[PDB]
Symmetry: D3
Subunit: 152 residues, 6 copies
C-alpha cells in the first residue's frame, strides 16, 4: 500500500498518567508520519480481551487487560511508508530492557508491564486493530503540504 | 468549579499541518492540567459558524470559518484550577504579534488569521463549546496520580 | 558582590516528585549562572521554621513547614551577576497564576502551595539562607571557563 | 512591504562560542520566519565600525567593535510579516537584565556586553545592514510549502 | 588530521522546508564539533552533478540532482577528531528506515530520496567536497574555548 | 535488590563545565529512576585512586586521577530495577566513538578522556562506590508516587 500504510498506536494508561502524550505524539510528528485518527478513550475489558486475543493463554493476560482498562488511553492511527515497521522501531523492543536509548521505551521506561505505548506488530494486525478501535468516519484524509519534502 | 473547572481547546488546522500537536499537548500536560477529552475531527462550516456565532458580522468571519474547515482539528477538553484563564495565558494574545515569547502564539506563529489554537474565553463559553464539540460520554473521569503534587 | 553575588535555590518536594530537577537545573545552567553548591536533603522541621522565620504569623506557615519537610528537597547555591533578582524573575511570581509562561512556575505550576521551587528574595536573605543550609566547605570555588563568554 | 519584510540578524561571537547557533536558528524557524541568507563570517573592524556607526561617540564603542571581531559571527537575513519588530521581541531587551524569561536574552544571557545576538532596530536599519553584510546574490527567494499555514 | 579533521555537511532542501536547520546544527554543536564554514546556497545542477559524480549512472541520479537543486541548501564544514566517521554515525544510514532512533535520519525522516542531510563519506571525499562548495577564504580558523573540555 | 537496586553516577568535571548537569539528570529522571543521593564535590586525589583502584597499572590512570580532581563533580545515587546495567546503556560505550547517538556520550562527547560521566560497571562496584562517596545518612528514602506507573 506504499505511503498509504496505516498503523494503530495507543498511549497506554501509564503514558497518560506520566504526562507523556505530547512527548509521544511529537516523536511521530517530527518523523514525518501523518496523524489520521485520534481519540482519548476508556477501553472496556471486552474490547481489550479481543485486542489482545492472541495473548489469552498467557499468565499475564488478565493483569494486562485490567491495567489497560484502569485509565484512559490515547488511541491513534498514523500513516506513511512502512509506518507499522518504523513505528515499532521508534517504540523499541516489547521489553524496555532490550530497547536502546533513542527509542520511546529506551528513553522513558523500565518494565515490560509498564511500557508506555502499543503499536501494531504487522500490517494484518494494523488492519484488525484499526477496525476494532475506530469507525470508518473517524479516519481522516488530509493533503499534507510538506508531503513533497518527505516522499520521492 | 474549583479544580474541576474545564476548558475547550482546539489545535487549529495549521497546528496539525505544522506538526505542533505534540508540542501543544506537552505544554498543558507539564503545566499540570488534566486531559479529559481528545479527538481529531474534520469540522463542518456549520459547526464552526455556531462555534464563532458572535463573530458573525466580522469582515474576517468567512476566512476564519473556511480556514478552520480546511483541515483536521484536534479538539480537547482540559481540566484544572483556573484552567480557562490560565490556558488563555499559555496560548497568548489573539494576535501573535502581541503574544510574548514563552506563550504558544509567541513562540510558534506570526499572524492573527493563522494562530495555531483556540481556547475558551470564559467558564460560560467553555460550557457551551464543550457541549458543542463533544458528546457527554466522550468526557472521561479518571483519578489522576499527579493532582497530589499540583494541589494543596 | 557583583559577578560573585550568590543566591539560595531549592527544588521543593513537588519538584523532585514530578521529576523536574534536571529541568530546573538546566534553566539556570543555560542562563550562564555558576553552580557552587548542590545537595539532596530531607530538611528537618526545626530548620524550615528558621528558614521561613519571617512568615511565622501567616495562616499557611504551619502547613508550609510540614510540607517542605514531607520529602527530599534539592538545595543549591548559584553564582553570577545579579543572580538573586534574576533567579526570581526566572522562577516567576509566588502565585503561579501571576507567573507568565517562560518562567518556571508559569510553565509548570498551578497553585501557590505547590510552586516547585524556592529562591532567596534579597541579597541579605541569600547570605542568611546559604549559611543556614550549607557549611562553608560545601560551597565550591572553581575556574569558570564559560565566564569569558558571559562577561565583558 | 508586508510579509516580504526582511531583517538582518547575527549570532555574536559569544553565541558561537557557547554553542547556541542552532538553538538561536531554531527559535526563528519554529516561529515561522523564512531564512533567506546565511553566512559564517570573520567581520573586519572596518565593517563593524560602519555597522555600529551610530554608536561611535559611546564609551563602549571600541570594546564593542573589538569583541565583535574577536571571533566568527553567524550573519543572517530572515523574512516575514513584521520580522524586524517581532525578531526584536524574540531577542528581548538590549540589556539581558530587562529581558524576560522566554526571550533569547532572558533565557541565555546576563550582561549587555555579552548579549548573544544582533537584530536590526528598524526597517531602515534592516535595509542598511542587509546591504552592508550581504551581496544581492546571497539573498535567496524560495517558495515555502507551509506558507499558507502561516499567512491569511 | 587529528582534531583538525574536517567534514562537509549539507542540510538538503527538505531540511530547510521542514524547519530543521537549527535542529541539525544544534546536534553537531552539542557533540563538540567546531563549525568552520556556513552558507545558505541555491546549488546549480552542474555543482550537484559534480558533487554526486560517482552516482552518474544510478537510476535515481536525476531525481537526486533535481531535488537538491529544488531549494536552498545549508552548506557546512565541521571540524574535530574523527568528524567524518562520527558525523555519518550522527546522521545515520543512507536509508532512514535502517537508521536507528537517536540519529538525525532515524528521528526526522522516512524515505531514502528525502533524507534531510548530506555528509562526506571519507576524509578524501570531504577534501574534494569542501573545495567544491567553499572558497578557501570561507573557511575560518578560530580559537575554540570549548576544546579544553572535549580533548585530552 | 530488584526494584531497589542502586548505582553510583558522577558528572565528571567536563560535564559541569559544559553546563550539562541538568541535561544528564533529566535523562535519568525521564527514564523513571529514583534519585536517592546528590552532591557537588571537589573529590580529593586520595579518594579517586581508591575509586579507580582497579585501573592502577593502566598508563592513563595517573592523569585520570588528576583530571577527576581538577574540578567539581556531581556525585549521585539512582535507584530502580536493573539501574546499574540500564545506566551504562544510557551513558554509552567508554570510548564515545563506539557510543551510538541517543546515548549520553554518543550525543555529547568525542574523546575517551573527556566522557562527561561515570557509572558503576556492576552491582558489586555500585555497593562499593556508593559507600566510598556517600555517608549512610546522605542516601534518602522517600515515597515514590511515580512508582505505581513505572512498575507492575
Ligand atoms: N511478561 C509480561 N508481563 C507483563 N506484561 C507483559 C508481558 N509481556 C507483554 N506484556 C504487555 O502486553 C503487551 C503485549 O505483548 P506482546 O504482544 O508480546 O508485545 P507488543 O506490545 O510488543 O506487540 C506488551 O506491550 C506489554 O504491555
Ligand atoms: N482581525 C482578524 N483578522 C483575521 N482573523 C481574526 C481576527 N481576529 C480574530 N481572528 C480569528 O478569529 C478567532 C476568534 O477571535 P477572538 O474570539 O476575538 O479571539 P480568541 O480566539 O483569542 O478568543 C481568533 O483566534 C483568530 O483565529
Ligand atoms: N497564600 C499562600 N498559601 C499557601 N502557601 C503560600 C501562600 N503564600 C506563599 N506560600 C508559600 O510560601 C513560600 C514562601 O512565600 P513567599 O516568600 O511569599 O514567596 P516566594 O517563595 O516567591 O518568595 C512560597 O514559595 C509558597 O510556597
Ligand atoms: N553599555 C554597554 N556596554 C557594553 N556593551 C554594550 C552597551 N550597550 C550596548 N552594548 C553592545 O552594543 C550593541 C548595540 O547597542 P544598541 O544599538 O544600543 O542595542 P541593540 O543591539 O539592542 O540595537 C548591543 O547589542 C550590545 O552588544
Ligand atoms: N536508492 C535510492 N533512491 C533514491 N535516492 C537515493 C538512493 N540511494 C541514495 N539516494 C540519494 O543519494 C544520496 C547519495 O547516496 P550515497 O552516497 O549512496 O549515500 P550517503 O549520502 O549516505 O553517502 C543519498 O543520501 C540519497 O539522498
Ligand atoms: N584509553 C584511555 N585513555 C584515557 N582515559 C581512559 C581510557 N580508557 C578509559 N579511560 C577513562 O577511565 C574511566 C574509567 O574507565 P573504564 O572503567 O574502562 O570505563 P567506564 O567508565 O565506561 O566504566 C573512563 O570513564 C574514561 O574517562
Amino acid at each position: 500500500t506504499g505511503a498509504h500504510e496505516r498503523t494503530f498506536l495507543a498511549v497506554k494508561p501509564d503514558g497518560v498518567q506520566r504526562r507523556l502524550v505530547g512527548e509521544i505524539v511529537r516523536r511521530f510528528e517530527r518523523k514525518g508520519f501523518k496523524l489520521v485518527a485520534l481519540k482519548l478513550v476508556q477501553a472496556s475489558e471486552e474490547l481489550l480481551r479481543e485486542h489482545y486475543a492472541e495473548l489469552r493463554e498467557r499468565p499475564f493476560y488478565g493483569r494486562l487487560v485490567k491495567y489497560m482498562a484502569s485509565g484512559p488511553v490515547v488511541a491513534m492511527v498514523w500513516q506513511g511508508l512502512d509506518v507499522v515497521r518504523t513505528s515499532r522501531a521508534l517504540i523499541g523492543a516489547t521489553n524496555p530492557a532490550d530497547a536502546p536509548p533513542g527509542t520511546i521505551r529506551g528513553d522513558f521506561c523500565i518494565e515490560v508491564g509498564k511500557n508506555l505505548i502499543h503499536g501494531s506488530d504487522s500490517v494484518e494486525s494494523a488492519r484488525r486493530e484499526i477496525a476494532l478501535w475506530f469507525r470508518a468516519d473517524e479516519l481522516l484524509c488530509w493533503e499534507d503540504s510538506a508531503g513533497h519534502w518527505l516522499y520521492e
